[PDB]
Design a protein around this nucleic acid. Structure first.
Ligand SMILES: [Mg+2]
Length: 1202
RNA sequence: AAUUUCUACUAAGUGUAGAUCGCAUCCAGUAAAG
DNA sequence: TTACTGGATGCGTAAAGGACG
DNA sequence: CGTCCTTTATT
């Protein structure tokens, strides 16, 4: 009974293995003498050029069919689409009409005589040349005759456009699912807003845009949809909505622009038309230090247009007082937070001063309709913001001094960068080497980017009642120029952040358009590539064009050494292959098929469906079985042992066997002298298939991909991992020069980088070079493999995980959380919430033999964050931080694999689609999304390298506990052994009671503080404990619906940390506050005494002391020792939870700190989800809803503790 | 600081630990408030 | 002020079939 | 003829 070992052999997946290809003997000389690498480097450049020409005809062909087309269901479909109350029967009716519309478009493409020609040999040889009218381009298309097969990959990408399926690539999908849906949405908007378009206004658009051929009204009729399937038609429909610029250039207004003015001027909010997506085929980075520089000097020198727009905006905002503050607006969003801080010094006083009108009891249903109407507002005027400004304070004037300050900072940074704009300037060193120059460019780009992004706020996205067009004329003219710095900034950074070496490479064909397409022995002559073995080494052997049969004549040599030549036989896609070989002209004449058989096949009765007859399909199987016996190329290759015909449920049952049996890989001997003579003579080219695990010097654990490769040829592998066709071979030219490589010379000691490593220094007898693999031309071989090609353990993975989890008695859950003090933190938990393991993943411990050496990835990030600070915040140090985290999670992935294998344990992760990231965490959402992907990817085939391959868990019996990755958005609910969870109330929660602070202790008023004190049931001093006790029922406070116990007694127990920072003893601080105001706190219930006090400084110290008491999480930034969690509430045995009581222990039953609490509590929400499983029936486990609500969580956290 | 490739390395000396789905094609613009 | 690649397509083929000398 | 390039068949 192990939940893990029930998830093997579940579904197939493809993977690619990569290797260096090292030429052997005279291979590279003979490749050089034949100029093969030059031919292929040119062919790659021509190949990319031909595809763009091929696109042109494909584009032109699409318009021919799209213009002719007329959709049949159009009116009926649109009405059914519009009904908002459709029976489920009518929803399936709509799907049928939607499918038929896509089929009308696709069948219009595929019904042509011409369609079949586009993806055949003919297009390059004949159809394209006649189409083109340029002599040069026709010559390029002519370069690829006899090379048509190599275009197959490109053809398929285009076949996707003409599919009828609802897929992103399809034309019919763009037309029907996307454009037609938008068209219908625009008809709805049109009828509401039809009248406001002026009679003159429409007659304009008909002559200016339409050219008088159609009326603007036609474009919002359903039957007129056919016009807009073409890109030409889309351009016209979008032009009505957006507006047009004629050949004369006169600006023509658009319908959506009219709507803007109306809703603006009348302070209304009518809807606006969606433009139509482009058709599917209608219409790069800087490459050198000289180009990167040339753009910086051209776009940002002191007489560039961007610098001209800065001088105009300086003159515009210098006259800020001259304009109407009622017609100047600031877009609502983050810019409201910033500008609020800029002038008052406070983020949320602008928040308050419109809360001032809007602001007293708070049901969250009212608090959302509060908080929401809030977000609805689009912008604020300078007058509205001045209405918020206290008297004697001018909002416009101190905005002027802030904007003007930002332009003066640009001009100062220009003077520090002035020599970078001399026509005389030349570059001494490369930019990445030249930290000084890159820092100068960055400083200037930043000062202009920040000025741009800050000024962008003065829009109001209007859509805005009467705007100061005198201000927004000069402002829009200058800003559209200034906006160009965004593209410039991103391009220059992306260049500096790049690596020094280049991964650029090109494909090698060896003059075969289907080169190395497959490995089948019979096709070895046609493909001219095969695999050899000599001891531990493996080789790719390529037969030269003039000697395709040279390897076939070789025989085994009894006396001398022998290569092992691969014997690879595959029967691919038997459902696809079996008919073509048996219904081919060549075989159909040989073997008389009874009319029943060709009927059944032409009728489709063997295929499952309403046309399906078991006996008919059975008859087809026996026909195939007999023909396979008569077909000896197949019968002799594979030892076929078919199940008896009568057993088969469908035709796929017979195919499934043929597919599994249709695979064989063995090796044949071949004379090493004869083969090596072929290589010497130039008849054969030989590369060693190589990574560093094949080196003589290599020792210790190999790469997981090295194991996959060797297992392809291991006789203990029985179709678990098949060697797939479609391998490719590339040349990646050297990107670095050897003389320019960083060297650590031999016999001189090199300092080690790891602080934890005891050995501080290493000395070798040989030289070592940084990035040596890019200082030389390198072949690389890509090999596709097929894992679990015939899966036998067919079940829905989530349903099985739910069945096992329910009936599993002691479910183990692995919780993972992101901490502020800890990159990641792990808590493993048994089926009842007890903590089994808890530790930080700040240090990755690497094992080699019995030795252990750890790496503190938290200290690595700390040193690189300090390196970021030094040298401002350099473009590279951010990349170095981004890559180091990416390599960190690849270490953690294996640490979770062990824990899943060790505890047979389910994983608990944060749902990043719902939760909100505090940004105190070191691992930002983006790096964590990447992690949760890698976790998914590894769990499709989870393998422990150090396990014996035949074992379950080993490289031949990998675990499949996770479905294939789909999207970041699909990382919700559950993916097999992984459950995604909201992070709400996982850290700031007492693990020993489930208690949470639901109180709002922010001070607003004396009157608001009095109702707060009165809402408690009792506040008294407890002499026998020297504590203050605050009894409360959460029902007497607002926004407290989620709590389940309701009644709690708080205590001023222990210390807190106020935030610089100070330590506050709660009990004595309350006594200090009460003594300052003459309150007698020993006199039983004190509640009347506090409310009697009339001083506001009392209630502010009182609310602040309540804030500290309910602040269960206490930290000092920069003090990793202080992250303690303390509860103001007692448990069952009258103990207060204090996380420092458990951080001391080696094995603690409760979390050791705030970061462990989250990982502890993320795992407990899975336990709740397992609890819901144990409530349902085996058949309805699919129906059980996993997502936990805050009210279900607080009920579980407060009852499960006991 | 060597790598099929990536990160961390130097890991006891031409390398260590973990990870690693390639190749082509198309369409995109969202986000985001204790 | 944000950092946007993120989504989905499709192949991972041997043997029929034909063109060209 | 052979040889090389093409085209094909799809639960
Ligand atoms: Mg290794």
């Amino acid at each position: 009974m192990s939940k893990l070992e029930k998830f093997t052999n579940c579904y197939s997946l493809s993977k690619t293995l990569r290797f260096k290809a090292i030429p052997v003997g005279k291979t590279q000389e003979n490749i050089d003498n034949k100029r093969l690498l030059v031919e292929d480097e040119k062919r790659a450049e021509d190949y990319k050029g031909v595809k763009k020409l091929l696109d042109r005809y494909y584009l032109s062909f699409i318009n021919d069919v799209l213009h002719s087309i007329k959709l049949k269901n159009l009116n009926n479909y649109i009405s059914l689409f519009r009904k908002k109350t459709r029976t489920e029967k009518e929803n399936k009716e709509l799907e049928n009409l939607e499918i038929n519309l896509r089929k009308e478009i696709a069948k219009a493409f595929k019904g042509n005589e011409g369609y079949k020609s586009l993806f055949k040999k003919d297009i390059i040889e004949t159809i394209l040349p006649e189409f083109l009218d340029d002599k040069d381009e026709i010559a390029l298309v002519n370069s690829f005759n006899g090379f048509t097969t190599a275009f197959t990959g490109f053809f398929d990408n285009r076949e996707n456009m003409f599919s009828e399926e609802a897929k992103s690539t399809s034309i019919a999908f763009r037309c029907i699912n996307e454009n037609l849906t938008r068209y219908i949405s625009n008809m709805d908007i049109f009828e509401k807003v039809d009248a406001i378009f002026d009679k003159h206004e429409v007659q304009e658009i008909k002559e200016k845009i339409l050219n008088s051929d159609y009326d603007v009204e036609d474009f919002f009729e359903g039957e007129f949809f056919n016009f807009v399937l073409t890109q030409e038609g889309i351009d016209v429909y979008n032009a009505i909505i957006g507006g047009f610029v004629t050949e004369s250039g006169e600006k023509i207004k658009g319908l959506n622009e009219y709507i803007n003015l109306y809703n603006q001027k009348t302070k209304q909010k009518l809807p606006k038309f969606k433009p139509l997506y482009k058709q599917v085929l209608s219409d790069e980075g800087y490459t050198s230090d000289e180009e990167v520089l040339e753009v910086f000097r051209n776009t940002l020198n002191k007489n560039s247009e961007i610098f001209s727009s800065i001088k105009k905006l300086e003159k515009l905002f210098k006259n800020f007082d001259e304009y109407s503050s009622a017609g100047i607006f600031v877009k609502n969003g983050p810019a409201i937070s910033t500008i609020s801080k800029d002038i008052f010094g406070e983020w949320n006083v602008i928040r308050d001063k419109w809360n001032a009108e809007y602001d007293a009891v708070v049901t969250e249903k009212y608090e959302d309709d509060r908080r929401k109407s809030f977000k609805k507002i689009g912008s604020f005027s300078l007058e509205q913001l001045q209405e918020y400004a206290d008297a004697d304070l001018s909002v416009v004037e101190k905005l002027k001094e802030i904007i003007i300050q930002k332009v003066d900072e640009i001009y100062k940074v220009y003077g520090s960068s002035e020599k970078l704009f001399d026509a005389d300037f030349v570059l001494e060193k490369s930019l990445k080497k030249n930290d000084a120059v890159v820092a100068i460019m960055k400083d200037l780009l930043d000062s202009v980017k920040s000025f741009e992004n800050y000024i962008k706020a003065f829009f109001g996205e209007g859509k805005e009642t009467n705007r100061d067009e005198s201000f927004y004329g000069d402002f829009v003219l200058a800003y559209d120029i200034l906006l160009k710095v965004d593209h410039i900034y991103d391009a220059i950074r992306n260049y500096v952040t790049q690596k020094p070496y280049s991964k650029d490479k090109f494909k090698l064909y060896f003059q075969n358009p289907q080169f190395m397409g497959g490995w089948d022995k019979d096709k070895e002559t046609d493909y001219r590539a095969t695999i050899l073995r000599y001891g531990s080494k493996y080789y790719l052997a390529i037969m030269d064009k003039k000697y395709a049969k040279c390897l076939q004549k070789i025989d085994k040599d009894d006396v001398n050494g022998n290569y092992e030549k691969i014997n690879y036989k595959l029967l691919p896609g038997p459902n696809k292959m079996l008919p073509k070989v048996f219904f081919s002209k060549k075989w159909m004449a040989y073997y008389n098929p009874s009319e029943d058989i060709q009927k059944i096949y032409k009728n489709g009765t063997f295929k499952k469906g309403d046309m399906f007859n078991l006996n008919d399909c059975h008859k087809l199987i026996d026909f195939f079985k007999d023909s396979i016996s008569r077909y000896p190329k197949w019968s002799n290759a594979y030892d076929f042992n078919f199940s008896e015909t009568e057993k088969y449920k469908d035709i796929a049952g017979f195919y499934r066997e043929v597919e599994e049996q249709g695979y064989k890989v063995s090796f044949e001997s071949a004379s090493k002298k004869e083969v090596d003579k072929l290589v010497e003579e130039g008849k054969l080219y030989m590369f060693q298939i190589y990574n560093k695990d094949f080196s003589d010097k290599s020792h210790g654990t190999p790469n997981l991909h090295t194991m996959y490769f060797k297992l392809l040829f291991d006789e203990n592998n029985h179709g678990q991992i098949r060697l797939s066709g479609g391998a490719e071979l590339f040349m990646r030219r050297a990107s670095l020069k050897k003389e320019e490589l960083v060297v650590h010379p031999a016999n001189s000691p090199i300092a080690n980088k790891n602080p934890d490593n005891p050995k501080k220094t290493t000395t070798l007898s040989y030289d070592v070079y940084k990035d040596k693999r890019f200082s030389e031309d390198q072949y690389e071989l890509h090999i596709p493999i097929a894992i679990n090609k015939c899966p036998k353990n067919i079940f829905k993975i989530n349903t099985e995980v739910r069945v096992l989890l329910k009936h599993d008695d002691n479910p183990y859950v692995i919780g993972i959380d992101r901490g502020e003090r800890n990159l990641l933190y792990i808590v493993v938990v048994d089926g009842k919430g007890n903590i089994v393991e808890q530790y930080s993943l700040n240090e990755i411990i690497n094992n080699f033999n019995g030795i252990r050496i750890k790496t503190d990835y938290h200290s690595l990030l700390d040193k690189k964050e300090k390196e970021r600070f030094e040298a401002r915040q350099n473009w590279t140090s951010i990349e170095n931080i981004k890559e180091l985290k990416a390599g960190y999670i690849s270490q953690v992935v294996h640490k979770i694999c062990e824990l899943v294998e060790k505890y047979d344990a389910v994983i608990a992760l944060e749902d990043l689609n719902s939760g909100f990231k505090n940004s105190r965490v070191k691992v930002e959402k983006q790096v964590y999304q990447k992690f949760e992907k890698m976790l998914i990817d590894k769990l499709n085939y989870m393998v422990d390298k150090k396990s014996n391959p035949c074992a379950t868990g080993g490289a031949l019996k990998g675990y499949q506990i996770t479905n294939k990755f789909e999207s970041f958005k699909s990382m919700s609910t559950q993916n097999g052994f992984i459950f995604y969870i909201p992070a709400w109330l996982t850290s700031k929660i007492d693990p020993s009671t489930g208690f949470v602070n639901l109180l709002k202790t922010k001070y607003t008023s004396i009157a608001d503080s009095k109702k707060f004190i009165s809402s408690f049931d009792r506040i008294m001093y407890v002499p026998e404990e020297d504590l203050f006790e605050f009894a409360l029922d959460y029902k007497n406070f607002s926004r407290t619906d989620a709590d389940y116990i309701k009644k709690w007694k708080l205590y001023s127990y222990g210390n807190r940390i106020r935030i610089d920072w100070e330590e506050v003893c709660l009990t004595s601080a309350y006594k200090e506050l009460f003594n300052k105001y003459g309150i007698n706190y020993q006199q039983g219930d004190i509640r009347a005494l506090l409310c009697e006090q009339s001083d506001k400084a009392f209630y502010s110290s009182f609310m602040a002391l309540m804030s500290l008491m309910l602040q269960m999480r206490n930290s000092i930034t920069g003090r990793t020792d202080v992250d303690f969690l303390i509860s103001p509430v007692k448990n069952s045995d009258g103990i207060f939870y204090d996380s420092r009581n458990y951080e001391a222990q080696e094995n603690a039953i409760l979390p050791k700190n705030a970061d462990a609490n989250g990982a502890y509590n993320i795992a407990r929400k899975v336990l709740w989800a397992i609890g819901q499983f144990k409530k349902a029936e085996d058949e309805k486990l699919d129906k059980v809803k996993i997502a936990i609500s805050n009210k279900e969580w607080l009920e579980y956290a407060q009852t499960s503790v006991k």
